[PDB]
Swiss-Prot record, chain A:
It is found in: Cytoplasm, Cytoskeleton. This is Cytoplasmic dynein 1 heavy chain 1. The gene is DYNC1H1. It is linked to Charcot-Marie-Tooth disease, axonal, type 2O: An axonal form of Charcot-Marie-Tooth disease, a disorder of the peripheral nervous system, characterized by progressive weakness and atrophy, initially of the peroneal muscles and later of the distal muscles of the arms. Charcot-Marie-Tooth disease is classified in two main groups on the basis of electrophysiologic properties and histopathology: primary peripheral demyelinating neuropathies (designated CMT1 when they are dominantly inherited) and primary peripheral axonal neuropathies (CMT2). Cortical dysplasia, complex, with other brain malformations 13: An autosomal dominant disorder characterized by global developmental delay with impaired intellectual development. Some patients show signs of peripheral neuropathy, such as abnormal gait and hyporeflexia. CDCBM13 is associated with variable neuronal migration defects resulting in cortical malformations. Homodimer. The cytoplasmic dynein 1 complex consists of two catalytic heavy chains (HCs) and a number of non-catalytic subunits presented by intermediate chains (ICs), light intermediate chains (LICs) and light chains (LCs); the composition seems to vary in respect to the IC, LIC and LC composition. The heavy chain homodimer serves as a scaffold for the probable homodimeric assembly of the respective non-catalytic subunits. The ICs and LICs bind directly to the HC dimer and dynein LCs assemble on the IC dimer. Interacts with DYNC1LI1; DYNC1LI1 and DYNC1LI2 bind mutually exclusive to DYNC1H1. Residues 308-450 are annotated as: AAA 6. It comes from Homo sapiens (Human). Dynein heavy chains probably consist of an N-terminal stem (which binds cargo and interacts with other dynein components), and the head or motor domain. The motor contains six tandemly-linked AAA domains in the head, which form a ring. A stalk-like structure (formed by two of the coiled coil domains) protrudes between AAA 4 and AAA 5 and terminates in a microtubule-binding site. A seventh domain may also contribute to this ring; it is not clear whether the N-terminus or the C-terminus forms this extra domain. Belongs to the dynein heavy chain family. Cytoplasmic dynein 1 acts as a motor for the intracellular retrograde motility of vesicles and organelles along microtubules. Dynein has ATPase activity; the force-producing power stroke is thought to occur on release of ADP. Plays a role in mitotic spindle assembly and metaphase plate congression. Residues 40-103 form a coiled coil. The chain holds residues 3698 to 4147 of 4646 of the full protein.
Amino acid sequence: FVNFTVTRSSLQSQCLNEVLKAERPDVDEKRSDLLKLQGEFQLRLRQLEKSLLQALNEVKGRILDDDTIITTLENLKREAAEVTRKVEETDIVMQEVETVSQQYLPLSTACSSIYFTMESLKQIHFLYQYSLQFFLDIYHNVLYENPNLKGVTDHTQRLSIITKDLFQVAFNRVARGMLHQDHITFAMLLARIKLKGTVGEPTYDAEFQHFLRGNEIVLSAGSTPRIQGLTVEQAEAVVRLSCLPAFKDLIAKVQADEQFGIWLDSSSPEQTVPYLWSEETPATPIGQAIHRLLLIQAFRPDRLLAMAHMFVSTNLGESFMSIMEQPLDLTHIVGTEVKPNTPVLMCSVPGYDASGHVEDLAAEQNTQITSIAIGSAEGFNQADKAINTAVKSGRWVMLKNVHLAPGWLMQLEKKLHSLQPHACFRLFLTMEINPKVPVNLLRAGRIFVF
Amino acid sequence: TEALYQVGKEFTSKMDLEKPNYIVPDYMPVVYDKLPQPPSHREAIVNSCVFVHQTLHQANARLAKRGGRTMAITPRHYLDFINHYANLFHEKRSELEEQQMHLNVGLRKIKETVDQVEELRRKVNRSTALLKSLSAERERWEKTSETFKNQMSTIAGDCLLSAAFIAYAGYFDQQMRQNLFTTWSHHLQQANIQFRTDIARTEYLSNADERLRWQASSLPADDLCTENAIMLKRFNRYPLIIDPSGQAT
């Protein structure tokens, strides 16, 4: 059995190799020297010794012009000395290697977590198809073509900048083809991934597990109205959070509190939540925010989305989602970072049109468009002809409403698997969100939601 | 376990796995009918082989427990492991002995060149350089001889681990492969068997030109891919590729 399947640890190792090759090329060169020390080093030492041997049997021990054999002998001496220094330094070079690799390990773990969450996004919606190549493109973009890495060279601030830019670029490249109501869910996923990543912060696994399922435990025996301002269902929520050790004394706390009622009736109470969780140590912003999130899950679950946005802002940095609020700027997305192999799959909720967006994009970038409707059979014929004649020149062929004929889109996927002669060639597929569109096409193309 | 021990001993009898200076450690009991109470080197090696099979079974059972997705292990796997161990040990030992004899031949040739220089003296300025470079090369080739004498001792455990990785370590992801390799390494350490410490499997089982051709033939540079390529090249049972992509094909 010879397995080529990608997995958590495989992605961790690949990401670690990439980051070591890019950020610390000297350390990676030491890796290469170490690996050739067991292998190629003694090999070319032997080859150079053999070369000295035919030099010896060639010069026949000449003495009049000795430098012919002296140069080779001194080269062998230098090579042997270098090998000797490297072998004597194996322990130190290796230990410094594990030091650097341990420095760059959380990045790889986070990368594996993010990629596999993105791949598991199939459960949320059928339109969330992502290939491995997509994530590797994200990583190649965040390593080389990172505007925030142009200046910094301390190798210690660069790591934090890389982490932040990685999270931001992943979110920006995913949410552009993802439903609006799923943005907050993906934000919580990324925030929890970074919360696992960050140092000095408890996992809060009990609090997360409560926030997810622990509110659904059976505690019907014990439901009391508490104060009249607290409803019976909110009282039951109080009981379930009192099961949590941090919020054990909520009942006594809400009895003592007299301003709790007006907060319960506030317009946006998530902006200012009273301090209820009892903890000796003053929790960091993240712990305070998650305790506040649980409290909001208890009282006023309507502001749950607002408090989730607040939590994501406090964890993943403020204005993390601000890119989504800004109107989509597809000129940069199409001009660069999209290979002509990948077709731009234009996905729109039924009852909406998106062809005007690519039309105005072409107007901005003064580029010809061969717009074709796929309804008729002659539509298929002319679409194929336009694709054939466009790769020869680079015309941005834009099909529309292609969800009607899934089989032809299977054929188009198979065709676009073949390489395109022209780089400037672009392809756009305007189509509705139907569960019949090819999954292979969705995975092989950039999905945009409108 | 006794059947595996007997067949392993019978198949490894042909191999020269006898080291008189080997020191018997404590503990490391796997086969419960070990022929001597203090085992010999060959018996320790066969015990390590049967431990490799047993721990493959244990890891398979644990993988089944924690998520399923388990392939059963058959005695054919043990026989393939033994054949890989035999062939790999033979290859490595043969290469080492050929390099040693080439070193000896070169030493005699350099001695003849020394004779030539001695006769030619009987210019002196170049002669002094020749003699000092001669002495330097002399100690260099001597230490090459002694380091061959040290590589010879560790040719057993390293080859055993490498063969086990070639045969047993398949269908297993990187984490499980590393866990199995470190388990075998710990067992060999407890058995006081001298294997190359922190040995890198890929370089020990592949040459520069092989990796170059693999990379030129559309192979990813990931360590998992290189290990899979090594398994592809050194195959006894015909390979089966589980590739979600078409890269391996």
